[model samples]
Target: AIQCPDSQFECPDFSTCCVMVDGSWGCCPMPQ
Candidate 1:
């Protein structure tokens, strides 16, 4: 059940890996 660029509802066990957002240096994991 693993997927990339997953939304909160679709995210499976992990978050955006090695990606950048808003010029920041981190990824937003779905609230578990």
Candidate 2:
């Protein structure tokens, strides 16, 4: 029921709200 910012996609780990960049969303591995 919450809304994120423009071009930002909600994440499951609650780390970051990512937006599409260069046709791909950057993701960092967990517990790295």
Candidate 3:
């Protein structure tokens, strides 16, 4: 499980931490 650097938010399974368009960190679905 990856985590966002600033927010330290844990990403869900099969997901990854990414920067959103709004400049916030969040969990995004991974490409299969």
Candidate 4:
């Protein structure tokens, strides 16, 4: 498994790890 830094989360391909204000982890659109 990949290590996620503090306040960071793992995301699937075509997306990037993003942090939410609610301490949630999500993905944002990313170009190929």
Candidate 5:
């Protein structure tokens, strides 16, 4: 799943932490 895990890391406001294609974690804009 490309979903964000809450509590895993601190994501910025209006954004979410997601797993990248390179198997790394990063932030992305939340779905509207």
Candidate 6:
């Protein structure tokens, strides 16, 4: 499983770790 450093979430394949506007971490989809 992929773990996001800043957040307690898992990033899926084809997705990247991103910071939210509220300073939280999340997974974002990659561009096609």
Against the true structure, what is each candidate's TM-score? 0.19, 0.23, 0.59, 0.41, 0.52, 0.53
Which residue segments of model 4 deviate by more than 4 Å?
1-10
Off by over 4 Å in 1: 1-13, 16-25
Q: Who wins the TM-score comparison?
A: 3
Cα lDDT for residue 9, model 4? 51
Error of 6 at 7 (Å): 2.9
| Residue 32, candidate 5: alpha-carbon lDDT | 94
Model 6 C-alpha lDDT per residue in residues 1-32, reported as the tens digit of each score = 36766577788887888877887787888778
- Lowest summed lDDT across 10 adjacent residues in model 5 is found at 1-10
- Candidate 2, RMSD to the unseen true structure: 4.5
* CA displacement after TM-score superposition, residue 18 of candidate 6 (Å): 1.0
Judge candidate 6 at residue 20 and give its lDDT: 74
Between candidates 1 and 6, the TM-score winner: 6
Tens-digit lDDT track of model 4 for 1-32 = 23356644566666676667987777768655
Give the range where candidate 6 is weakest over 10 consecutive residues by summed lDDT: 1-10
Tens-place lDDT per residue, model 1, 1-32, is 45545333333355643345554334458667
Q: List the residue pairs that clash in candidate 5.
A: none
Better of 4 and 5 by TM-score: 5
The 10-residue segment of model 2 with minimum total lDDT is: 1-10
Q: What is the C-alpha RMSD of each candidate to the true structure, in Å?
A: 7.2, 4.5, 1.6, 3.6, 5.5, 1.8
TM-score of 6: 0.53
User: Any runs in candidate 6 off by more than 4 Å, and if so which?
Assistant: none
Task: Flag clash pairs in model 3.
Answer: none
- Write the candidate numbers in order of decreasing TM-score: 3, 6, 5, 4, 2, 1
Clashes of each: 0, 0, 0, 0, 0, 0
